[PDB]
């Protein structure tokens, strides 16, 4: 069944083929699409892309909109891919979760554009492509598989290159020790509150996020005798029993 081309609450089917496999005797994959907007930096004029292909990197979304432009003459500012958490490697950010410095939904992706004309243009253009597949499946523009899954991901047994991760370690430790010395200087200056108060700081506490987190993780004597009323009450307690 083919003629269905629009879902219930704002969605678009964009289907496409799969190339030749040696052991599959119309292999077709889907893309759910939905346009949306917000007011912040990179949530305005974005397309929710649901069921994006398995490791769909920058380059074949790029050629997808490139042959959209070379086929139907669209406008596309597509050089970016956002929220592409494919296999589940970046759900949390353990760097920001363990320390403050060097810092400060499931199977979805974010395709931002820049123009409202571009979002309306490409939205109705892929709606047209949805409808034209919905009436006929024959000559859709398709997946050019100049294989990026076999080079842009196959690193699992390739050793890491020596000078590369040498330079990576060098610049990362340089900038980290720089802003760590900054965070030690900031707390080991004389922190003075703006009325008159002076913040108590340990000898080697080295940051102020540590102070406030120590605050959050850290969020009488006797007598039963010797008084007139107390020994009167205990003498009456002896009278009780």
């Amino acid at each position: 069944i083919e003629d269905i081309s629009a879902m219930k609450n704002g969605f678009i089917v964009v289907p496409f083929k799969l190339p030749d496999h040696k052991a599959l005797p119309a292999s077709l994959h889907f893309m759910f699409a939905k346009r949306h907007q917000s007011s912040n930096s990179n949530e305005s004029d974005c397309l929710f892309l649901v069921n994006l292909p398995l490791l769909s990197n920058i380059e074949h979304m790029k050629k997808f909109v490139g042959q959209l432009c070379g086929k139907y003459d669209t406008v596309s500012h597509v050089e970016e891919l956002l929220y592409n958490d494919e296999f589940g490697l970046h759900e949390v950010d353990l760097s920001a979760l363990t320390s403050d410095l060097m810092s400060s939904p499931r199977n979805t992706a974010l395709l931002k554009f820049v123009d409202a004309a571009s979002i309306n243009n490409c939205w109705n253009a892929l709606k047209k492509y949805s409808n034209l597949h919905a009436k006929h499946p024959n000559e859709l523009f398709e997946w050019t598989y100049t294989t990026p899954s076999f080079t842009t991901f196959v690193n699992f047994y390739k050793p890491l290159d020596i000078d590369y991760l040498k330079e990576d370690i060098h610049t990362h430790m340089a900038i980290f020790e720089q802003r760590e010395a900054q965070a030690q200087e900031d707390v080991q200056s004389s922190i003075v509150d703006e009325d008159g108060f002076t913040l108590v700081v340990g000898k080697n506490t080295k940051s102020l996020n540590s102070i406030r987190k120590k605050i959050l993780n850290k969020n009488k004597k006797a007598k039963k005798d010797f008084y007139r009323f107390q020994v009167r009450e205990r003498k009456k307690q002896e009278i009780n029993q």
Binding site: I1, I4, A6, M7, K8, V13, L18, P19, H21, K22, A23, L24, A26, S27, L28, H29, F30, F32, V50, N51, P53, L54, Y145, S149
Partner: peptide
């Protein structure tokens, strides 16, 4: 996903083992 009508969605079994093969 591979929905056929508008409400129901079923597994896209053909494409998932095709991209396993890919």
């Amino acid at each position: 996903v591979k929905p056929v009508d508008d409400e129901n969605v079923i597994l896209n079994k053909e494409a998932i083992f095709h991209e396993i093969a890919a």
